[PDB]
Design an enzyme around this catalytic site. Sequence first.
Site, PDB file in Angstrom:
ATOM      1  N   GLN B  11       0.877  -1.066   0.037  1.00 38.30           N
ATOM      2  CA  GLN B  11       0.066  -0.169   0.037  1.00 38.30           C
ATOM      3  C   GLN B  11       0.942   0.885  -0.223  1.00 38.30           C
ATOM      4  O   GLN B  11       0.521   2.215  -0.846  1.00 38.30           O
ATOM      5  CB  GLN B  11      -1.375  -0.247   1.612  1.00 38.30           C
ATOM      6  CG  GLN B  11      -1.501   1.512   1.553  1.00 38.30           C
ATOM      7  CD  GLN B  11      -2.762   1.547   2.465  1.00 38.30           C
ATOM      8  OE1 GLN B  11      -3.651   0.753   3.127  1.00 38.30           O
ATOM      9  NE2 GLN B  11      -2.193   2.275   3.955  1.00 38.30           N
ATOM     10  N   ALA B  12       1.583   1.111   1.421  1.00 41.09           N
ATOM     11  CA  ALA B  12       2.899   2.231   0.451  1.00 41.09           C
ATOM     12  C   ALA B  12       3.167   2.537  -0.484  1.00 41.09           C
ATOM     13  O   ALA B  12       3.899   3.983  -0.911  1.00 41.09           O
ATOM     14  CB  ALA B  12       3.656   2.532   2.345  1.00 41.09           C
ATOM     15  N   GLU B 254      26.026   6.404 -10.110  1.00 40.19           N
ATOM     16  CA  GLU B 254      26.369   6.975  -9.361  1.00 40.19           C
ATOM     17  C   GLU B 254      25.588   7.527  -8.211  1.00 40.19           C
ATOM     18  O   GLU B 254      26.712   7.749  -7.279  1.00 40.19           O
ATOM     19  CB  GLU B 254      26.828   8.254  -9.925  1.00 40.19           C
ATOM     20  CG  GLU B 254      27.640   9.039 -10.704  1.00 40.19           C
ATOM     21  CD  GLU B 254      27.260  10.282 -11.683  1.00 40.19           C
ATOM     22  OE1 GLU B 254      26.698  10.248 -12.708  1.00 40.19           O
ATOM     23  OE2 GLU B 254      27.315  11.766 -11.277  1.00 40.19           O
TER      24      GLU B 254
HETATM   25  N1  GTP Z   1       4.220   7.413   4.502  1.00 39.72           N
HETATM   26  C1  GTP Z   1       3.507   6.527   4.001  1.00 39.72           C
HETATM   27  N2  GTP Z   1       3.616   5.450   4.365  1.00 39.72           N
HETATM   28  C2  GTP Z   1       1.743   4.533   4.759  1.00 39.72           C
HETATM   29  C3  GTP Z   1       1.143   4.435   3.641  1.00 39.72           C
HETATM   30  N3  GTP Z   1       0.683   3.558   3.843  1.00 39.72           N
HETATM   31  C4  GTP Z   1       0.827   2.902   4.839  1.00 39.72           C
HETATM   32  N4  GTP Z   1       1.665   3.714   4.768  1.00 39.72           N
HETATM   33  C5  GTP Z   1       3.024   2.759   6.082  1.00 39.72           C
HETATM   34  O1  GTP Z   1       2.595   1.810   6.311  1.00 39.72           O
HETATM   35  C6  GTP Z   1       3.150   0.721   7.011  1.00 39.72           C
HETATM   36  C7  GTP Z   1       1.828   0.358   6.772  1.00 39.72           C
HETATM   37  O2  GTP Z   1       2.321  -0.419   5.627  1.00 39.72           O
HETATM   38  P1  GTP Z   1       1.694  -1.099   4.212  1.00 39.72           P
HETATM   39  O3  GTP Z   1       2.092  -0.559   3.137  1.00 39.72           O
HETATM   40  O4  GTP Z   1       0.442  -0.189   4.051  1.00 39.72           O
HETATM   41  O5  GTP Z   1       1.210  -2.582   4.478  1.00 39.72           O
HETATM   42  P2  GTP Z   1       1.475  -3.707   3.167  1.00 39.72           P
HETATM   43  O6  GTP Z   1       2.853  -3.337   2.730  1.00 39.72           O
HETATM   44  O7  GTP Z   1       1.144  -3.370   2.066  1.00 39.72           O
HETATM   45  O8  GTP Z   1       1.627  -4.940   3.766  1.00 39.72           O
HETATM   46  P3  GTP Z   1      -0.284  -5.994   3.923  1.00 39.72           P
HETATM   47  O9  GTP Z   1      -0.948  -4.709   3.380  1.00 39.72           O
HETATM   48  O10 GTP Z   1       0.768  -6.431   5.243  1.00 39.72           O
HETATM   49  O11 GTP Z   1      -0.448  -6.710   3.219  1.00 39.72           O
HETATM   50  C8  GTP Z   1       2.612   1.336   8.161  1.00 39.72           C
HETATM   51  O12 GTP Z   1       4.244   2.061   9.174  1.00 39.72           O
HETATM   52  C9  GTP Z   1       2.498   2.700   7.362  1.00 39.72           C
HETATM   53  O13 GTP Z   1       2.000   3.780   8.272  1.00 39.72           O
HETATM   54  C10 GTP Z   1       1.104   5.361   3.095  1.00 39.72           C
HETATM   55  O14 GTP Z   1       0.387   5.791   1.996  1.00 39.72           O
HETATM   56  N5  GTP Z   1       2.484   6.605   2.932  1.00 39.72           N
HETATM   57 MG    MG Z   2      -1.529  -3.325   2.289  1.00 42.60          MG
END
Ligand code: GTP
Ligand code: MG
Lengths: 423, 440, 54, 345
Positions: B11-12, B254
């Site tokens: 998601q992130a 680089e």
């Molecule tokens: N800066 C930022 N952090 C994010 C975002 N989405 C999730 N996070 C962070 O990512 C962490 C959770 O991981 P995610 O990326 O949401 O989970 P995932 O990679 O989708 O993995 P699963 O849902 O467990 O399958 C938390 O610390 C959130 O604060 C975003 O859009 N921006």
């Molecule tokens: Mg997720």
Amino acid sequence: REIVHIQAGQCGNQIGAKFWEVISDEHGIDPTGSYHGDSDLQLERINVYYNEATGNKYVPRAILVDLEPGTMDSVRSGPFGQIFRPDNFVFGQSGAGNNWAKGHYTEGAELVDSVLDVVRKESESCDCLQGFQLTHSLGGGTGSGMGTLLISKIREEYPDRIMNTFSVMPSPKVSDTVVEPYNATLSVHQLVENTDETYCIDNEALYDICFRTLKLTTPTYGDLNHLVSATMSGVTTCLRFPGQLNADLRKLAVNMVPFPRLHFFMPGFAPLTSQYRALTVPELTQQMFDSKNMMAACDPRHGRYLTVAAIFRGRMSMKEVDEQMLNVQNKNSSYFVEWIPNNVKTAVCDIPPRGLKMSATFIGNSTAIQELFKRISEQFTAMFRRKAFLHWYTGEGMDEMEFTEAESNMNDLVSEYQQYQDA
Amino acid sequence: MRECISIHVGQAGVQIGNACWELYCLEHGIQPDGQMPSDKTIGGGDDSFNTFFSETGAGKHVPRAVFVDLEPTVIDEVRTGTYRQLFHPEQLITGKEDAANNYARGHYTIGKEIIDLVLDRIRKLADQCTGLQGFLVFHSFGGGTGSGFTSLLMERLSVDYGKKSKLEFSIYPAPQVSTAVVEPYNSILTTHTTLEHSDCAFMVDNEAIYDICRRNLDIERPTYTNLNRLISQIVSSITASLRFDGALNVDLTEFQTNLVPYPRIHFPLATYAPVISAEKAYHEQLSVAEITNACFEPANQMVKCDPRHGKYMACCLLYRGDVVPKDVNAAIATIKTKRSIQFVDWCPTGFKVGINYQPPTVVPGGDLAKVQRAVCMLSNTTAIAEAWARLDHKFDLMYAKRAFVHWYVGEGMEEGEFSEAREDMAALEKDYEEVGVDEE
Amino acid sequence: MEVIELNKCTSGQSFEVILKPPSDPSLEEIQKKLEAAEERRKYQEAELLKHLAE
Amino acid sequence: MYTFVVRDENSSVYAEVSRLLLATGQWKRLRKDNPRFNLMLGERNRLPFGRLGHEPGLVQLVNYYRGADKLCRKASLVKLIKTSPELSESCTWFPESYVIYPTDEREVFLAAYNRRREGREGNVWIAKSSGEGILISSEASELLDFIDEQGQVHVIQKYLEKPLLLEPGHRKFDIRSWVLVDHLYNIYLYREGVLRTSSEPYNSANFQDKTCHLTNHCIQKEYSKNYGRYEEGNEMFFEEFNQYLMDALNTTLENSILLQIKHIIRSCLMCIEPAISTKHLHYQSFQLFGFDFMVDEELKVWLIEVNGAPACAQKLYAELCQGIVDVAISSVFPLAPTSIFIKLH
Ligand SMILES: Nc1nc2c(ncn2[C@@H]2O[C@H](COP(=O)(O)OP(=O)(O)OP(=O)(O)O)[C@@H](O)[C@H]2O)c(=O)[nH]1
Ligand SMILES: [Mg+2]
Ligand SMILES: Nc1ncnc2c1ncn2[C@@H]1O[C@H](COP(=O)(O)OP(=O)(O)CP(=O)(O)O)[C@@H](O)[C@H]1O
Ligand SMILES: Nc1nc2c(ncn2[C@@H]2O[C@H](COP(=O)(O)OP(=O)(O)O)[C@@H](O)[C@H]2O)c(=O)[nH]1
Ligand SMILES: [Ca+2]
Ligand SMILES: [Mg+2]
Ligand SMILES: [Mg+2]
């Protein structure tokens, strides 16, 4: 990601019926399965609990189970009675006689294959079955004995799915029969092994809340169930509406269960209703952590919080919500374990419950829950040391050893909660 | 012209990919339908932007990006969003159920069932490259996909694309917006498995960008949209040299050459300035000296730490806007006299400066004001090891009780991997100490 | 100070300021790692189904 | 109310402040490893500064300045004065010092040892380190034979063989000052210093005897035969010492000594301020210091050492510790008039 709901026994079906009554209103669905709502937030995650039929009618993914037809008929004729799938009613005629053995070994064993057939046909139509939630009591026979039989059979067939229960704990203050400690102790042994999450709902707490707080002099089961359906709606808010925290059953279990056997939760709700002035964010936070708002009849100051999940419903400022949550744990940090950093997670939902503009539901994995199992254990041993009322069970084929094992396993659960209370 | 493939995991990773690629299109003048009237070579070219965008016969400029998530909600936003015409369906990959914040579930259980699908999709983009130079991987430390699947992908990428550069943009877990308690576990596990496969990794602490959004943008409760649009600006200033004409950091190698003399110590600290609220009606534009001075203020760093109590190994200054070298030099001379800038005695006390005359682009309607000049500093300081210490300490608190470890073992992972990963972080922590530290 | 390697173009400009001088796992192994976890995951489920069969 | 933790229990100064934090009824103490604190009374070595300032919704304060050791160690203080242009090496208030390891200053130390020998000037030096090293001699050969025999790093300093001697007694002393630096880097000098004196008369010919040369309170308790004749515990306070300077020298403590002390304190702390300040940090620091001064026959004040974890005189524990709560703690965490400190800066 769909959830399959199952309600078993008199208590489970009556509480389950109120639950579907409450959330159907929150999702804008009339008693005829038609949607007449005003917000798309109602329909965004509607598939978690409802199937769709032609004509844009929504059918609950609910399965009604009982060993006598009495309560089943009451649900079919009551409010929201015809919203349920007609062939999802699976019932017998003998009953279980408040006897865990009859529900788990004899009478319920004759009926369990019929239920699993309905569970199977509901699961086969799921895009990505998330897991199961069960509503039942532990003090009776069908919800207690047959309920835990269903869980064991469902786990055998769907072993990589989350098993969730709302379990009503018996109390001598709201008692039907004296054998309730037997049925409850036998059921806890099953729940410790075969569920991932169990919301412990103590009928003693529900009574006291109705008596002392809500000012109900002669509380009824309907009064107690108004409290249960309100917390059931709150603890499932993260599952039914768009959110980021504890949005599915497995993610909630990963955040709430640090050790497999310690998955019994204390729920809490604020404000308690039986309402014209809206509550403030400081007022919601103070109440949802107060003992008087707990549904498990355990003082949280007698133990420590392993993990805590809190949800806030309504249009409020997330800033004041974070400030108040941080204020209650920074000024009561002795009641939170220090070896699980940041064990308090908060979620917010813009949709408030009916009649309330602000609400807060609390989910706590506290070591104080051992107070509940110790009460049951003392009531159990008091009869079992004289082998009292045992013939009802040995007549259904059970041996004294099975009682000794359930007793020992629950005392271990109590001892294991005491282990982590010290660090 | 050497192409770059961006991989967004979790998601992130996906939501930051949206913020970045939206900003890339605004910077290169690419419309949401993939059309760029600025490009007069229809159907191809060897221009600088072609490292991130390929061209079709119809003139569509398509990102060299693949989005991967074990869960369809976030990517379905892209399939129906403003830039739905930008990507083609092959670039967007979604699984059935997610990793549930479980590293082992993302790495082993679900990772095995989708890793060959992802690699084949990455091969499809790689085959359209006359000379691919490597990958930029965006993911979170805390999520089960972002941690578990990325480390598996980074392992296979080293196998299928040997000695091809891989740079990370990693989101460090912060409890103010975190969703899971086990994120320390996931962070340590993914850093262990990925360390030898990453040439240079830029860590962004959600805590740092959260406070920057509160202080500088006056946002009460920053959302992920607030956070990602600020992150994208930092990412754009770091990848600008790959997308525009220039002579500093023009290829992925680089970055390692300029910032990473020690391969394990490949986590540069990023600092950005100025961050000005667009709602701020009146504003006085900051000078080169003022924004360069802000690069040595902890409140503007992507990871909160004190560089005064560490040692530097390299420093890059990346400017965008009205900046001439004379202003930079006069600023660096002023800063050296007033601040504690201690280099390791074996590295030269120096600064590699890059200037792109185009001022930074801001999304219209966003929270950031358009500024006449901005700078992003990339400094490989040992002070970033404070972030490892915090993480390792939270890992230690939970692991001493074996809290939550059954969730990972239940997915096939052995308890020993916890020890192997924690021992590696200890070694990494000791490495930073060797490089940066010398009743009365 | 000293400015070196000054490169210019219409797009921008880069240079360097000096102030003081100085003083792998294979594919087969990865597939074995994932299959080892898959077997451990299947052994645990088999013990569960064995436990439920009893 | 506010919360705090204690991570150095064998600290007499801060054992008292945590006792005062109780009586206010607005501070609760936590265990050592509870992270949800507003204030840390941290440990003396390897204090985890890196874990501070990362708790949402918690203003966090610590009783030590990261990087202050460069001032509170013999080897680093010599280096700091020698290389900082603010101190400019040639500052007049610090004795000639060289850092000799058992990089290296052994060559330049012997160079000044020859100059002092050529002019037939007073050539007596002292060898000290981070316990006690206790070596004073007139030849550098006996100094190094002792330095290499010892393990840790020692630093050589010119011995002030012409000290100010108190009468009656013909005895030397050292002046201890307590300085508190708050989170805003204001520099507060506690009005009450203390003189740690010697009980035996000073002797120029017997450097091997280290009782009338070393003014440490532990050594006067151990080796002095007539310890405690003139003052209780070899500790003379400012009102008596100032009275002596008036009767004997027709001057005051403020004019003859304290002006130089305030200048030395201000100089040392204003130098390292950019390196240790927590003005724009995610956590904030305050710290109590113990400056050790030396006075000569001509009323010139010399800085000898800065102590980063000082104790206090028994008589002055209450007044000073309450001052730390008012100035350094309640200033960041308020509760629900003349000052005991002297604001310098
Ligand atoms: N800066 C930022 N952090 C994010 C975002 N989405 C999730 N996070 C962070 O990512 C962490 C959770 O991981 P995610 O990326 O949401 O989970 P995932 O990679 O989708 O993995 P699963 O849902 O467990 O399958 C938390 O610390 C959130 O604060 C975003 O859009 N921006
Ligand atoms: Mg997720
Ligand atoms: N250069 C010098 N000239 C004269 N006397 C000196 C001197 N250097 C040290 N002394 C004497 O030596 C004594 C002890 O020195 P120092 O303060 O280094 O010991 P110490 O650091 O072990 C005690 P503390 O616990 O206060 O730090 C001083 O009180 C002073 O009288
Ligand atoms: N809260 C609540 N508890 C109930 C209700 N009905 C029964 N109980 C409790 O459940 C236990 C009896 O279980 P019951 O559901 O009647 O047995 P079953 O029908 O055989 O499964 C006793 O402890 C009762 O106090 C109800 O509607 N609400
Ligand atoms: Ca072109
Ligand atoms: Mg009944
Ligand atoms: Mg000392």
